Subunit: 114 residues, 4 copies
């Protein structure tokens, strides 16, 4: 099944934050309406924040997260959670190796803002 | 129901990160085994990452998030989600006012790390 | 925070199923647009299905679950999960007593159907 | 990533319920400790409950859901959600075709019972 793809409400501000937990340098790309809108890179084995940004979902609402490590695409897991019918989280983990911890880059998208 | 309380794997490092989306200055307290382990504060209406830290869940694994604004406890919502039977997120929203957006402080706990 | 309230896409069929795990008889009411659309009742300590139905979210999409036992509303917990950006679950637990198992009536809403 | 595999607490009763939404007859097999413990079959486009059953997770706690249509495995999605640090849902969707609604068989696992 496809993972890392989320439909947000149109024309809505959202936060996107990435963390790293791997020996490999993580490159996280965030696409809005199929065009790169943010890119983060960094290395950590201690959950460092490798980037944070606020984006707009635009007319389509389509947001996609991609992760690669030294040009190799990582396998993704994802889901969306809604609390009290208002607070949204889109969650992504990724695996760059063999241990299947799926934390090598972790991406959190949240909305609404403000 | 109680919210913002999570049983983590014992003796395990976890990430905790807080975001602010309110006119009010947020204060986030993270308790491990019923003792304060981290405190974050800030004021933003644009999802600022007012704190991020790595903690250990200790011998009991009990982690609790509390949020206040000008000394008043915020109302909390929370849940935990597990992806691919391994990757964990504990999620908290909070409301300091009357609009019920529940984003005024948002807290994400993630494990495993490394 | 409010629990057991979900906004579905408008005019969309959804399934609702309720389970019982309590000494007490559970009555589950499902409201669409703030009017009762289905009512289930039964008693089990073995997770019996006490009702299942397909409903239409209607023009507003506003669906609410309420649970009563022994003449008093139960305390509710809830969240919504979306898998592969397609498959939606709205989940409710309820507590009618003192043990805080929150399983006394369990309600699952799923969409889309067909 | 692997989907439809969950680790439950050992020696714990749990509920498993399957729904169908497809032209194809769904076959759902629930394995405990790698051995089939329940099987359900049926065709519906209207979310019929093709089976429900209470099982014990046994010494291993390992529970796996498999879905097929006339012997062809369906593609699975899954996640687990915990409410108020106590009430557990393991969720599975499956796709037998090309439309990626992932509802063709839907399986819900819930614990604790009683
Ligand atoms: C330090 C190690 O780096 C990579 O091999 C990751 O895939 C592992 O999960 C671990 O983080
Ligand atoms: C700017 C406003 O600040 C407070 O009133 C918050 O409770 C609102 O949600 C909003 O963020
Ligand atoms: C048999 C018992 O019945 C009620 O007291 C419930 O609140 C308990 O959770 C338990 O199910
Ligand atoms: C009636 C149709 O039957 C199969 O093709 C399913 O894969 C579709 O999702 C739809 O339910
Ligand atoms: Ca890894
Ligand atoms: Ca890792
Ligand atoms: Ca607010
Ligand atoms: Ca706010
Ligand atoms: Ca109870
Ligand atoms: Ca009970
Ligand atoms: Ca399908
Ligand atoms: Ca279908």
């Amino acid at each position: 099944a496809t993972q890392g793809v989320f439909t947000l409400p149109a024309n809505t501000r959202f936060g996107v934050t990435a963390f790293a937990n791997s020996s490999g340098t993580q490159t996280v790309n965030v696409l809005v309406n199929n065009e790169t809108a943010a890119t983060f890179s960094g290395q950590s084995t201690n959950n460092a924040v490798i980037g944070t940004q606020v984006l707009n979902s635009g007319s389509s609402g389509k947001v996609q997260v991609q992760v690669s490590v030294n040009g190799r695409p990582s396998d993704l897991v994802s889901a969306q959670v809604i609390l009290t019918n208002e607070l949204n989280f889109a969650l992504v983990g990724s695996e760059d190796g063999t241990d299947n911890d799926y934390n090598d880059a972790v991406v959190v998208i949240n909305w609404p803002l403000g």
